[PDB]
Amino acid sequence: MADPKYADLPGIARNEPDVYETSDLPGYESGEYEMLG
Amino acid sequence: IANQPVVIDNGSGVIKAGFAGDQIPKYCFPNYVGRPKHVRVMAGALEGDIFIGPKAEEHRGLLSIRYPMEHGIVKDWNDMERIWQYVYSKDQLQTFSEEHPVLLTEAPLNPRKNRERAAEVFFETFNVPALFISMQAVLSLYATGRTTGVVLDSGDGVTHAVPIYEGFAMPHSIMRIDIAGRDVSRFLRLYLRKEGYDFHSSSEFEIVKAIKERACYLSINPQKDETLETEKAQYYLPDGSTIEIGPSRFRAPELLFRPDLIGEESEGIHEVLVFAIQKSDMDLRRTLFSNIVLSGGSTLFKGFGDRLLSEVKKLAPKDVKIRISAPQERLYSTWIGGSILASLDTFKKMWVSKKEYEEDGARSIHRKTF
Amino acid sequence: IANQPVVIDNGSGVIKAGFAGDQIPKYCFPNYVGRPKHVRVMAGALEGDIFIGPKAEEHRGLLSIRYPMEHGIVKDWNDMERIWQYVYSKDQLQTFSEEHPVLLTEAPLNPRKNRERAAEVFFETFNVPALFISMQAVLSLYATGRTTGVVLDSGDGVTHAVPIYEGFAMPHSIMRIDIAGRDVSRFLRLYLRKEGYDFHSSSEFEIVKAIKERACYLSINPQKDETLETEKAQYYLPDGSTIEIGPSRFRAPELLFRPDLIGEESEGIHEVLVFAIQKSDMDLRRTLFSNIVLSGGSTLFKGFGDRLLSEVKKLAPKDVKIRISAPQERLYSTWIGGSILASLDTFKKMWVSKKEYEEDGARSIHRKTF
Amino acid sequence: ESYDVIANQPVVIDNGSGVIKAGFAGDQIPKYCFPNYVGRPKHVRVMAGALEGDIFIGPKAEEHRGLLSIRYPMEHGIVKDWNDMERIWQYVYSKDQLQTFSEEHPVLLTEAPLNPRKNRERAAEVFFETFNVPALFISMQAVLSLYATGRTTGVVLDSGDGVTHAVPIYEGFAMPHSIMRIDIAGRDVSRFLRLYLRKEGYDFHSSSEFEIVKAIKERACYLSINPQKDETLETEKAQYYLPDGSTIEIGPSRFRAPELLFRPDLIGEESEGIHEVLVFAIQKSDMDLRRTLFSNIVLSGGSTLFKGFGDRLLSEVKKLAPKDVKIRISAPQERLYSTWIGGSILASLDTFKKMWVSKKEYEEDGARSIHRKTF
Numbered sequence A: 001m002a003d004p005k006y007a008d009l010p011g012i013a014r015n016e017p018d019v020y021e022t023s024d025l026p027g028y029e030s031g032e033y034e035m036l037g
Numbered sequence B, C: 001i002a003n004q005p006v007v008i009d010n011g012s013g014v015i016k017a018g019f020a021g022d023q024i025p026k027y028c029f030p031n032y033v034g035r036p037k038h039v040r041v042m043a044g045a046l047e048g049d050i051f052i053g054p055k056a057e058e059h060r061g062l063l064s065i066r067y068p069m070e071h072g073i074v075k076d077w078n079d080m081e082r083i084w085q086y087v088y089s090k091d092q093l094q095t096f097s098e099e100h101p102v103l104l105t106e107a108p109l110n111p112r113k114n115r116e117r118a119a120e121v122f123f124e125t126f127n128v129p130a131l132f133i134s135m136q137a138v139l140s141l142y143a144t145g146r147t148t149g150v151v152l153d154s155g156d157g158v159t160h161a162v163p164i165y166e167g168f169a170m171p172h173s174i175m176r177i178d179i180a181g182r183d184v185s186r187f188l189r190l191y192l193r194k195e196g197y198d199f200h201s202s203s204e205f206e207i208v209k210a211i212k213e214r215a216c217y218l219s220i221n222p223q224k225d226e227t228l229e230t231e232k233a234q235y236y237l238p239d240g241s242t243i244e245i246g247p248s249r250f251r252a253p254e255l256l257f258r259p260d261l262i263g264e265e266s267e268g269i270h271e272v273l274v275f276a277i278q279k280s281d282m283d284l285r286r287t288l289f290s291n292i293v294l295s296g297g298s299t300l301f302k303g304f305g306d307r308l309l310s311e312v313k314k315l316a317p318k319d320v321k322i323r324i325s326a327p328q329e330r331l332y333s334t335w336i337g338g339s340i341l342a343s344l345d346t347f348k349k350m351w352v353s354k355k356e357y358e359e360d361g362a363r364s365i366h367r368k369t370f
Numbered sequence D: 001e002s003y004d005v006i007a008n009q010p011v012v013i014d015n016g017s018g019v020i021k022a023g024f025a026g027d028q029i030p031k032y033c034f035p036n037y038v039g040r041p042k043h044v045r046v047m048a049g050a051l052e053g054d055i056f057i058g059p060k061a062e063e064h065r066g067l068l069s070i071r072y073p074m075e076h077g078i079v080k081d082w083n084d085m086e087r088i089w090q091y092v093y094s095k096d097q098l099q100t101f102s103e104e105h106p107v108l109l110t111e112a113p114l115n116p117r118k119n120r121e122r123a124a125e126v127f128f129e130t131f132n133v134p135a136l137f138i139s140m141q142a143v144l145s146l147y148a149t150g151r152t153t154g155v156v157l158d159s160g161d162g163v164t165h166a167v168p169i170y171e172g173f174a175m176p177h178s179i180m181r182i183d184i185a186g187r188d189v190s191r192f193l194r195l196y197l198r199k200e201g202y203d204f205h206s207s208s209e210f211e212i213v214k215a216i217k218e219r220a221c222y223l224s225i226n227p228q229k230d231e232t233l234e235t236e237k238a239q240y241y242l243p244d245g246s247t248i249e250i251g252p253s254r255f256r257a258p259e260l261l262f263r264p265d266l267i268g269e270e271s272e273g274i275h276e277v278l279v280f281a282i283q284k285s286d287m288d289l290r291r292t293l294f295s296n297i298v299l300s301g302g303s304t305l306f307k308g309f310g311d312r313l314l315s316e317v318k319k320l321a322p323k324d325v326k327i328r329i330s331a332p333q334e335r336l337y338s339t340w341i342g343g344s345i346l347a348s349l350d351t352f353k354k355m356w357v358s359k360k361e362y363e364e365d366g367a368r369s370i371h372r373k374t375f
Ligand SMILES: Nc1ncnc2c1ncn2[C@@H]1O[C@H](COP(=O)(O)OP(=O)(O)O)[C@@H](O)[C@H]1O
Pocket: B010, B011, B012, B013, B014, B154, B155, B156, B157, B158, B181, B182, B212, B213, B214, B296, B297, B298, B299, B300, B301, B331, B334
């Protein structure tokens, strides 16, 4: 984080969300094939 | 003398590796090398210029896929040797190649120079105790538990039918055709481009291969399903986009039964099976019709059995009983055979020792194979 | 000499300079030269015809502001050289340029002659031990500590999006647009003239820049606020006079999403981000939407995240998860990245030595740029 | 029955991605050639007696280009915007071009090979439903070029603005499995050149300015016999004069931009090079024909007009081709108009009377009618 170190700087964004994200929403065949004469 | 021999099925599509006695191959990975196409700029990136198996499956988009072996013939030996080096890596098996003997399963009617070069690698690079090369067809029957029977093995690389009597393969009745699973995937790609879905990249062709395996049906009547309007079933691509496959689903896999579609003047897979039996002596034909075994990956298409049985009836003689046996584990029939053969005490006499190879050379593997 | 390398973030608005190992840039000053327009009559006046940084900030009214660099391209090298001379002055850092190595951070897809001339100065004028030019996007990844991620850096000079996967930068997927923070301030000024507030002077335009940074919000629905006509927010000028900004507050910054407003036939910032991802291979597209990193000063507008996320969702595929990560230190992320890269032991191999430059010349820095 | 609407002189329409070439069967040259894009005015009309209409096509859009925003309706020989393409086909029968009734004259359209079936299917519906045309015949680009040259046998390497493809045809027999087409074409080279001009420091953001980049490409771009030799050496920067009067120094971008045709890896597309496409298409054919196909090579399309194209292609083909094989590359002087002249000859031939599909047959069988009796 290092907030007291970046705190000296004028252009540090605060009171904003860090991440903007979208809402979370929600057998082979056998053998035995035969035919008689 | 050793602890336990390692069975390695050198399949065109996927390499199946495990120990003799194992019920299933523990380590199965695709038989291709993936190299990163994009430039590395940032530190702590993916290390190495070579990715094989699950590492290449996860980061497929980054890599350029090159298959070292086509129609069961190794074009690039440097890549093929590196893949066999990966077989003994920490990911797969994780054992010493000098400690365990090896059983390799090669396609029928291959050149002798392939077996000679293959043998050199495992005795020189890997200093293997003993090497035994085995046929794909004979092992498939050992797994099924039948001594006599015709093996229709339609693989990723090549399709072949071997009539085998009491464990002996009739060298004159063997019929092999270059057309295989890889040709259906390329042949499907031609229909997807005409429908308006482009997959130019080698990484994109692996999605077409996944689409081919997922959505393809073998129509009982070709013309009937061609004339009827399809539902145009949608498939979800990795990115999230949906494609409508439509008539291309069942029109692509027809190539196996009609080689005229790609323009190759060969017999259909159903003609191969019947023709191979008709070449054999009159006394066995009836037994060979009674004992038909299906193998290979391209047999897994839905309705393959019902379509093949109908096609065999047209080509087969009248008043002949046709019994086609398809094991549930079609893909693993060749490997399971190798596991059984390796477990038999006779296997100690069958394989070629490193010492015998050094003495006679290429002759050693030709004498105790043929 | 193996002293701490000096990181210089060559921003169009403000130059951020410090030594490798420092958490924050100790010395940040505006990137313009101020020359006195008024006549000196009295003795004991401000000495010098050139004022840079805090001396120009305090006596702004006396000075005429001229920006040497526009859209990340140096128009006047004489002025920029005096500013780079000021970086080594008694006010900022106060060190010898021949003792410390230099790390420069340039924008992507800059002219070849711009980088070439900049390098000549640091090898000829300044006898620097070694020089390494780095990308703005790659340094942002060191800062965040992620190898994979799309870096949408919207600066004062230029806006660009560079998609990088596991430390691999796709050079064909980079999208750069001239429209940036400085152009929005000029576009805002046009609305103040329509309201009846004149700011002709270069010193007065800096007040319009201060108004832009103070009072501007990006509305989720543009048309709603245009039709609504909300209460005109009052701003207090340096002298004490009050101006009513009114609808110009939120209508001016819209330019980022609608370039048609200024009349430039370019893509919007939300289109640039999505289009740059859509250019990537199918496998990576989903991951790149999942890993989006915002940087640059022009992202600091209130409701930027909410507006961009909505616009990206409209263009992006359906049912794909979009997670946009914006560091609180957006402005200072690029510099601290340069500090990390310079701190790495590997960096000694990365830079070009003064001797290496003298031998091969411009060719050396042209090869070892990426 | 005798004086039907079928006995009118058929109109040939070459559906080119870059330029549409229109004329009557029997005409020596295409009389009406205009660019294949729609121009709409971006600026606002304030004063009376201004340029009337929101749509400008051909010479009206060429003269007032700065005013208009250019949008191409067709990309890689596939119609992206059908509404715009219909307005262009309506303009083909306007008072400016041809000036005839679409229901009176039959039409011959020339589409690229290996196009989508829905693209051709939708195009046909327009010419049967919107335009009450007597008869429509879709023809291949390759076969028409051979009618023009007057050769039954020959490999047609047609590198157009939209797509590049090679069709090997032997004694009037087209091998449908040997046809190879790649999306990379003249229009993509202009975008690739634009990237080099920005690196030199010349910006052309506007759609109207992109037409100047195309004009720069056509004027100053040469295909070097050795790429790397000219890449490593610093060449003399040739100066180009812009419409306004300003001068730009183009420099090494001249030969670095057009290389894309032989090296698709430059734009990042993992496709075959133009020299590989030609040789690979021949190598797919039977042994008996391979030698004849190398002996009979025909160049077509606009993208062959680059300086040293012939010398570079021959060198690249020779490296890939078998040793001691005779390679004869045939280039007609009228490369651009070779496809159209073919359509004029084919339509004029008596045999054509059986080839075209009637409106009645289309209404009965539908899409089946136009999908049959083609290729
Ligand atoms: N479910 C499936 N349906 C259809 N074809 C399949 C299916 N699964 C795999 N295949 C095909 O079978 C191939 C696998 O064959 P493979 O196991 O390599 O055989 P062998 O090793 O004996 O040559 C795949 O590459 C694919 O082409």
